[PDB]
Amino acid sequence: RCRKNTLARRKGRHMGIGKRKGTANARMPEKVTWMRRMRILRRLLRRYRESKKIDRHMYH
Amino acid sequence: VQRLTYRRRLSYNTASNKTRLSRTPGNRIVYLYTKKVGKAPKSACGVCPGRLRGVRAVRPKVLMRLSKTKKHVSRAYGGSMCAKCVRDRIKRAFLIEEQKIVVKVLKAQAQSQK
Amino acid sequence: PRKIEEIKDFLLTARRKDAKSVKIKKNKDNVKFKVRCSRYLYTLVITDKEKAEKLKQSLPPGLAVKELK
Amino acid sequence: SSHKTFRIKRFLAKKQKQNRPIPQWIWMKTGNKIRYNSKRRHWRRTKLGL
Amino acid sequence: AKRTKKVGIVGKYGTRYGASLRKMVKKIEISQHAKYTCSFCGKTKMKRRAVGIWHCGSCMKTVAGGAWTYNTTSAVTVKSAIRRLKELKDQ
Amino acid sequence: GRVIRGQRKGAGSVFRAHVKHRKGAARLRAVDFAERHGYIKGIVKDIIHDPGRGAPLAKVVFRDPYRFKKRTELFIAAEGIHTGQFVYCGKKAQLNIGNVLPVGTMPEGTIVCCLEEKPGDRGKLARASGNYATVISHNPETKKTRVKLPSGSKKVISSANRAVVGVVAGGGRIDKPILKAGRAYHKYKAKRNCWPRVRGVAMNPVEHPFGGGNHQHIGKPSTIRRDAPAGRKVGLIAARRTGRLRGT
RNA sequence: CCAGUGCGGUAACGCGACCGAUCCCGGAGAAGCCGGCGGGAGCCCCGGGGAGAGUUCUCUUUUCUUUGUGAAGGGCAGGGCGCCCUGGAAUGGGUUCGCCCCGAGAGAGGGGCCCGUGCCUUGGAAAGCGUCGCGGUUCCGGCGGCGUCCGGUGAGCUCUCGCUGGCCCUUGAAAAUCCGGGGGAGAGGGUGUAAAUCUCGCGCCGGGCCGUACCCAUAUCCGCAGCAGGUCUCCAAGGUGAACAGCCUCUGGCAUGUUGGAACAAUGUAGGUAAGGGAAGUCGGCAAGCCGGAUCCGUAACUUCGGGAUAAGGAUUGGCUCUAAGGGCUGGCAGCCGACUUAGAACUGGUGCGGACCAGGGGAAUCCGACUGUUUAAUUAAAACAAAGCAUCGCGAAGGCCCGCGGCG
RNA sequence: UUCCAUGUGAACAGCAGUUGAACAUGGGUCAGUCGGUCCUGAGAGAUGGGCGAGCGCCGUUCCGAAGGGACGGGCGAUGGCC
Ligand SMILES: [Mg+2]
Ligand SMILES: [Mg+2]
Ligand SMILES: [Mg+2]
Ligand SMILES: [Mg+2]
Ligand SMILES: [Mg+2]
Ligand SMILES: [Mg+2]
Ligand SMILES: [Mg+2]
Ligand SMILES: [Mg+2]
Ligand SMILES: [Mg+2]
Ligand SMILES: [Mg+2]
Ligand SMILES: [Mg+2]
Ligand SMILES: [Mg+2]
Ligand SMILES: [Mg+2]
Ligand SMILES: [Mg+2]
Ligand SMILES: [Mg+2]
Ligand SMILES: [Mg+2]
Ligand SMILES: [Mg+2]
Ligand SMILES: [Mg+2]
Ligand SMILES: [Mg+2]
Ligand SMILES: [Mg+2]
Ligand SMILES: [Mg+2]
Ligand SMILES: [Mg+2]
Ligand SMILES: [Mg+2]
Ligand SMILES: [Mg+2]
Ligand SMILES: [Mg+2]
Ligand SMILES: [Mg+2]
Ligand SMILES: [Mg+2]
Ligand SMILES: [Mg+2]
Ligand SMILES: [Zn+2]
Ligand SMILES: [Zn+2]
């Protein structure tokens, strides 16, 4: 039963504003969104720096 | 989930009563009471905050049983003072005494002036 | 427990006075000779079976040999 | 207390050996006035001192 | 962004202790939490270890100074007076 | 009535000073030949914080002049001292900040701290956080010296006693408002048990001579004599004048 | 004849030992609270394989349980460095979730050390466990076959390691115990069957004394008692959920808390519901009731500019079928994987949708006290006390205040 | 000693009991490695000393000849291939 419900949570069901009790900053916090976005972006920039795609100054 | 218990009579979360978990060969999770984290020796300089290199970082009554090379490093002042301050003291103990030679030469030639 | 790599060191270990017994564990892929010295259990781990039976012939005679399973 | 000292444990050993009843070959003696052990001690009621 | 108008380091004390007391604490909390330049290496790393104990993060050199600033006006006045008295004694 | 709080402070039960985590007594070094005729050199090893003391201490190592051994000591750190500084001390130690030389040699107008009251007792006068005492004048015969103490009062001093040249470090401490009762608590817990002072009219008349009454009023005049017995000597002990000091 | 208290590396430092005393120097012992992040396990989760059970009226390659390696060595991943060498950086670079680092040497190469609680290995498959089956009719650490496998994830919970910052008119223990160094007093042997000395590898002997059962709490403790009270800790699964909230469940535990049966009257005690009116009751809205989560909006006076503030006031909320956006890995493209979310759209139900639980009533003002805190254990939690702030007063030590029968207390 | 087993049902378990932490017989706690022991902490406490009619009290480094240890060397003896 639990796994049949979490399949629907993957598909997006049972996640509307009715079935929500925490603050969005408690459900998935914006510090965590920020730090995930920066481990995306700074690894993108050092890939593009080390692969000669952009130089030091454009990188910085 | 197999909840587990202490194996000594000390039932408090003290500094001496701290454990890790392990899985025995009879597929069972059991505490193991760990020895505390020994710190590597600090230099006799009073300046450098990093602890010395090349010396074992053990709880200090173990140091009876370790051999000599495990507890020092093969340098003058070694195993008790960092390398940067050893070479600084070499330069300082040279240059002070060279200035002392210069001072005795200058005062002897001022007496020769007199 | 101590593992011995070469076979000459195991023979020197097995001919030592402290050795009470040697025991021969014959699993698949492997043969282990375990000598019970007075401080450690020394294990020789060898995978050649004709060299295993040659070594079993090459144990000293007075030492108590026991083959295990 | 499972951390007893030796003197405490010795005292408790004497009290639990004293806590046994009358032996039944006494109340046939000639000059007897005993009918039971009056100085007994149950471990809920009397708490022994210490 | 500028997140306040008047309160700086002492917006942490909320609506409390009085306007004049929070305004009078502000200058001193700024001054003791600022990082000052070391005169021994030049790096801007004199932090207040404890009350009167400034410490450089890079020289590893500790200077006994004031309780809220690296040095006090009375201290620098006394230092200039002592070197003037020394040169008047020693000519 | 009872025995009042000011009476009970002198028994030393809970009112002793909380001196476990203190670093030691902050004293000058003992008078010997090397400090009575010349000067001895020792370096500041570090500067430590004495709990319950607003002034920081300077742990300074000298070299013992009679056997191969190294003495370590604690000073009142003159403001501007640092580590690695060679503090000189003695009669012929020259005049700059951190040194400690006798008062009969430094000129008039110098600014000294950790001053030594009677010659030899290792530094008593002018040793709180940021506080100095000046040398006013001298007297070559009879070898005494007037010193203006930090109370604004002046004292005639035998001219052979030591003094650290400069103001005490930790200066200007009181001008920050303790904002909250937590800061006052953590101040006075590291000093000694004195802080939540219940004022005397809030008490009952049994354990303080002001309490009781259906209004919190003192009743009797607050200014009282010095030959009041203890347990009465409460409130304004022998006030010369008593009001708001307008004027000087 | 002479030498011989070891050797290697530019260096950090390494090698299995590598003489040395009274004396000196230092380290470990030996440190606070909080925040943030990273590494490691334990547990949880998902996708598969086995083995056994559970369902099977129909469906379910289904559902549940289990699927292992100790201490101590050897190697290696993995973290950390305020370690070393080359070289010299502006067009300033490097880099973190935040910081922060640099001509007192940054990037870039190449090394070194520490912790390596994780993996492999020795122990270790012999043993353990799960299954199937034989023996001893017994009295068995009995004997056999098989198996104990391969992957992925994560702001997950607990523990621990590490880096880094913040707070202090707060700087957060001692000593036993152990080690390194500086010194160079001495000792060793005269070329050998060498010696003094060895903190290296083995080998021999020993470690006395006292405590160890059990309860640990709605029945082993103290409350006179098997008393609804009180009593310091450790471990902590699945679902919903922000959660260690509340509610339901699995391992585990228990029998409803010093009795049972039969009725269902009054008074209760404890839950609820009520038309119409809404405080008309009463000293007083006492008790009850309303509100309540989240998202999207909107938020006045006053003010110490910090607040007030979830001010007030609205709307939305379910189920289902979708769409779009937010990543890695390998060789502006292609391939292959792995997560939770968020926004929007359609359909849809007797307008029900934070459907149980969880969960602020709101405003306009007066008085007092600034606040946080404390207070009469058992009739008074307050406007009282305390507080920071402000102002006084005494005292420069043979002193101020105070204790004490006494004392160079 | 309530722990565990065998038995009982007088008393106790606010009813009852075939049950019990009840009663009566018997057993039961095994250590170099787990603690105590050792160390100092806040503190306590003799000696010197001082006080006190006095049991004693203050005092804890202060009005103390406060060490019984040692490298080496010399002396005299001992046991052992002196
Ligand atoms: Mg943010
Ligand atoms: Mg393991
Ligand atoms: Mg080494
Ligand atoms: Mg009781
Ligand atoms: Mg008294
Ligand atoms: Mg108090
Ligand atoms: Mg009163
Ligand atoms: Mg009175
Ligand atoms: Mg670099
Ligand atoms: Mg097996
Ligand atoms: Mg040397
Ligand atoms: Mg037990
Ligand atoms: Mg009931
Ligand atoms: Mg019942
Ligand atoms: Mg009960
Ligand atoms: Mg109604
Ligand atoms: Mg109605
Ligand atoms: Mg009426
Ligand atoms: Mg009315
Ligand atoms: Mg109400
Ligand atoms: Mg309002
Ligand atoms: Mg008014
Ligand atoms: Mg209040
Ligand atoms: Mg009350
Ligand atoms: Mg009964
Ligand atoms: Mg029983
Ligand atoms: Mg054993
Ligand atoms: Mg005494
Ligand atoms: Zn250094
Ligand atoms: Zn600096």
Curated annotation (Swiss-Prot), chain E:
<keyword id="KW-0863">Zinc-finger</keyword>
<dbReference type="GO" id="GO:0003735">
    <property type="term" value="F:structural constituent of ribosome"/>
</dbReference>
<dbReference type="InterPro" id="IPR011331">
    <property type="entry name" value="Ribosomal_eL37/eL43"/>
</dbReference>
<keyword id="KW-0689">Ribosomal protein</keyword>
<dbReference type="GO" id="GO:0070180">
    <property type="term" value="F:large ribosomal subunit rRNA binding"/>
</dbReference>
<dbReference type="InterPro" id="IPR002674">
    <property type="entry name" value="Ribosomal_eL43"/>
</dbReference>
<dbReference type="InterPro" id="IPR011332">
    <property type="entry name" value="Ribosomal_zn-bd"/>
</dbReference>
<dbReference type="Pfam" id="PF01780">
    <property type="entry name" value="Ribosomal_L37ae"/>
</dbReference>
<dbReference type="GO" id="GO:0006412">
    <property type="term" value="P:translation"/>
</dbReference>
<feature type="binding site">
    <location>
        <position position="38"/>
    </location>
    <ligand>
        <name>Zn(2+)</name>
    </ligand>
</feature>
<feature type="zinc finger region" description="C4-type">
    <location>
        <begin position="38"/>
        <end position="59"/>
    </location>
</feature>
<comment type="subunit">
    <text>Component of the large ribosomal subunit.</text>
</comment>
<keyword id="KW-0479">Metal-binding</keyword>
<feature type="binding site">
    <location>
        <position position="59"/>
    </location>
    <ligand>
        <name>Zn(2+)</name>
    </ligand>
</feature>
<comment type="function">
    <text>Component of the large ribosomal subunit. The ribosome is a large ribonucleoprotein complex responsible for the synthesis of proteins in the cell.</text>
</comment>
<keyword id="KW-0687">Ribonucleoprotein</keyword>
<keyword id="KW-0862">Zinc</keyword>
<dbReference type="GO" id="GO:0008270">
    <property type="term" value="F:zinc ion binding"/>
</dbReference>
<comment type="similarity">
    <text>Belongs to the eukaryotic ribosomal protein eL43 family.</text>
</comment>
<feature type="binding site">
    <location>
        <position position="56"/>
    </location>
    <ligand>
        <name>Zn(2+)</name>
    </ligand>
</feature>
<feature type="binding site">
    <location>
        <position position="41"/>
    </location>
    <ligand>
        <name>Zn(2+)</name>
    </ligand>
</feature>
<dbReference type="GO" id="GO:0022625">
    <property type="term" value="C:cytosolic large ribosomal subunit"/>
</dbReference>
Swiss-Prot record, chain F:
<protein>
    <recommendedName>
        <fullName>Large ribosomal subunit protein uL2</fullName>
    </recommendedName>
</protein>
<dbReference type="InterPro" id="IPR008991">
    <property type="entry name" value="Translation_prot_SH3-like_sf"/>
</dbReference>
<comment type="function">
    <text>Component of the large ribosomal subunit. The ribosome is a large ribonucleoprotein complex responsible for the synthesis of proteins in the cell.</text>
</comment>
<keyword id="KW-0379">Hydroxylation</keyword>
<dbReference type="InterPro" id="IPR022669">
    <property type="entry name" value="Ribosomal_uL2_C"/>
</dbReference>
<dbReference type="InterPro" id="IPR022666">
    <property type="entry name" value="Ribosomal_uL2_RNA-bd_dom"/>
</dbReference>
<dbReference type="InterPro" id="IPR014726">
    <property type="entry name" value="Ribosomal_uL2_dom3"/>
</dbReference>
<dbReference type="GO" id="GO:0003735">
    <property type="term" value="F:structural constituent of ribosome"/>
</dbReference>
<keyword id="KW-0694">RNA-binding</keyword>
<dbReference type="GO" id="GO:0019843">
    <property type="term" value="F:rRNA binding"/>
</dbReference>
<dbReference type="Pfam" id="PF03947">
    <property type="entry name" value="Ribosomal_L2_C"/>
</dbReference>
<keyword id="KW-0963">Cytoplasm</keyword>
<dbReference type="InterPro" id="IPR014722">
    <property type="entry name" value="Rib_uL2_dom2"/>
</dbReference>
<dbReference type="InterPro" id="IPR022671">
    <property type="entry name" value="Ribosomal_uL2_CS"/>
</dbReference>
<keyword id="KW-0689">Ribosomal protein</keyword>
<keyword id="KW-0687">Ribonucleoprotein</keyword>
<dbReference type="InterPro" id="IPR012340">
    <property type="entry name" value="NA-bd_OB-fold"/>
</dbReference>
<dbReference type="InterPro" id="IPR002171">
    <property type="entry name" value="Ribosomal_uL2"/>
</dbReference>
<feature type="modified residue" description="(3S)-3-hydroxyhistidine">
    <location>
        <position position="215"/>
    </location>
</feature>
<feature type="cross-link" description="Glycyl lysine isopeptide (Lys-Gly) (interchain with G-Cter in SUMO2)">
    <location>
        <position position="41"/>
    </location>
</feature>
<dbReference type="GO" id="GO:0002181">
    <property type="term" value="P:cytoplasmic translation"/>
</dbReference>
<feature type="cross-link" description="Glycyl lysine isopeptide (Lys-Gly) (interchain with G-Cter in SUMO2)">
    <location>
        <position position="233"/>
    </location>
</feature>
